[PDB]
Amino acid sequence: VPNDILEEQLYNSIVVADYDSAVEKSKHLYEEKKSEVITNVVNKLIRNNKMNCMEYAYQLWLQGSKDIVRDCFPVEFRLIFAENAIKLMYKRDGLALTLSNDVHGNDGRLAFGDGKDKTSPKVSWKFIALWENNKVYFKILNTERNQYLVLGVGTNPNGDHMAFGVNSVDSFRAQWYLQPAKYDKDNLFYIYNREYSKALTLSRTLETSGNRMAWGYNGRVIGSPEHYAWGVKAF
Ligand SMILES: [K+]
Ligand SMILES: [K+]
Ligand SMILES: [Pt+2]
Ligand SMILES: [Pt+2]
Ligand SMILES: [Pt+2]
C-alpha cells in the first residue's frame, strides 16, 4: 500500500527478471496515478546500471503499455523501442557513429565516429529489438546502408574487435545488449556485443580526418559512462 513498499516490490521483480510481474504491478500503478512509483523505480534501476531495465521497458512495450514507457522512462527508451531514426553519440568525444563508403571485403563497411558529420543521413541508425531467453537484444541498423553493426572475428593486440556494418545476421556478432547509466542530466548506455560481450567504443587513436575507429573494447567500462557510453538522440 504505501508507495515506498510498492516501489520496492516493483524494483525487486525486475531485479529477479520476472518481467510479467513487473508489467502487471506497473499497469496497476499507472492506472492509479502512481507513475511516481514507476519513475522512481526506473531512476533506481538506472543509477545502479541494471541491464534488466531494458527488458522491463521492452516487456511494457510488448504488453500494451507503451504509454508507461513514454511517460515514465528517459526519452531514449521510446526512441529505441519505436525504432525512430537516431544518432549514436559517444559521450567522451561527442562524435556520431557512421559507416565508411568503401567495403572491407566480407566484413562490410568500416564503422567509426565521424570527425565532422553529426547531422547528415549518413549518421542515422535504428534499434531493432528482439526477445530470446528472457533477454532483449538489438540489431543496430545503419539506415542509409541497410547494414547491421557487427563485431568482426579478428582482434587487435589488446583483444579488441573491429566494428563493421554488414549485410547479414546469422551470428550473435550482429546483436547487442544495453545497460543504462547516468552522467549529469544525461541518460547514456553501454552497448555490449552479444557474441563477445565487449562494449562498443571509439578508439583513443585519432585518424588525421578526425575520425575514430569503432571497436568492441576488451576492458572494463563500468563506472565511467563519460568515457565508454553512448547517448541516443532523435535524428
Ligand atoms: K508470460
Ligand atoms: K491499488
Ligand atoms: Pt501521481
Ligand atoms: Pt579491407
Ligand atoms: Pt580507419
In the reported structure, the alpha carbon of residue 3 is separated from the centroid of ligand 2 by a whole-number distance in angstroms of 10
* DSSP designation for 220: -
Question: Beta strand 147-155 with 135-142: parallel, antiparallel or unpaired?
Answer: antiparallel
CA of 151 from ligand 5 middle (Å) equals 15
CATH of the domain at 165: 2.80.10.50
Q: Read off φ and ψ for residue 100, nearest 5 degrees.
A: -70, 170
Which technique was used to obtain these atomic coordinates? X-ray
Centre of ligand 3 to C-alpha 54, Å, is 23
Collapse the DSSP code of 86 into the 3-class scheme (helix H, G, I; strand E, B; otherwise coil) and give the result. Answer: strand
Task: Return the bridge partners of 190, or none.
Answer: 179
Q: How many angstroms separate the CA atoms of 16 and 135, rounded?
A: 12
Residue that is last in its domain, among 74, 105, 123: 74
> Are 121 and 196 members of one domain?
yes
Instruction: List phi, psi (to 5°) of 211.
Output: -70, 150
Residues listed for the chain: 235
Q: How far is the CA of 155 from the centre of ligand 3 (A)?
A: 51
* Same-domain check for residues 198 and 104: yes
27-33 contacts, C-beta under 8 A, 24 or more apart: 27/63, 27/65, 27/68, 30/65, 30/67, 30/68, 30/71, 30/72
- CA of 26 relative to ligand 3 center, distance in Å: 13
CB 124 within 8 A of CB 235: yes
Cα separation, 12 vs 95, whole angstroms: 36
What CATH number did the domain enclosing 15 receive?
A: 1.10.10.2400
Q: What is the distance in A from the centroid of ligand 5 to the CA of 72? A: 40
| Boundary of a domain, candidates 25, 44, 74 | 74
For residue 225, how many C-alpha atoms fall within 13 Å in the half-sphere facing its CB?
A: 20
Contacts of 138 (CB under 8 A, 6+ apart): 80, 127, 128, 129, 130, 175, 176, 177, 178
The three cell numbers locating residue 93? 568525444
47 CB-contact burial (10 Å; exposed 0-12 / middle 13-18 / buried 19+) = exposed
Centre of ligand 2 to C-alpha 66, Å, is: 21
- Nearest ligand to the CA of 102 is 4
Q: How far is the CA of 24 from the centre of ligand 5 (A)?
A: 48
Instruction: Judge contact between 29 and 35, C-beta under 8 A.
Output: yes
Q: Provide the 3-class DSSP secondary structure of residue 46.
A: helix
What are the residues whose beta carbons fall under 8 Å from the beta carbon of 24, sequence distance 6 or more? none
Which of the ligands is closest to the CA of residue 33?
3
DSSP 204: S
| Residue 177 CA, ligand 5 centroid: distance in Å | 25
Number of domains in the chain: 2
Distance 77 CA to ligand 2 centre (A): 26
- Distance from the alpha carbon of residue 21 to the mean position of ligand 1, in angstroms: 9
Ligand number nearest to the C-alpha of 99: 5
Domain range enclosing 164: 75-235
Q: How far is the CA of 20 from the centre of ligand 1 (A)?
A: 6
Task: Please indicate, yes or no, whether residues 203 and 216 belong to a single structural domain of this protein.
Answer: yes
Residues 40 and 156 in one domain: no
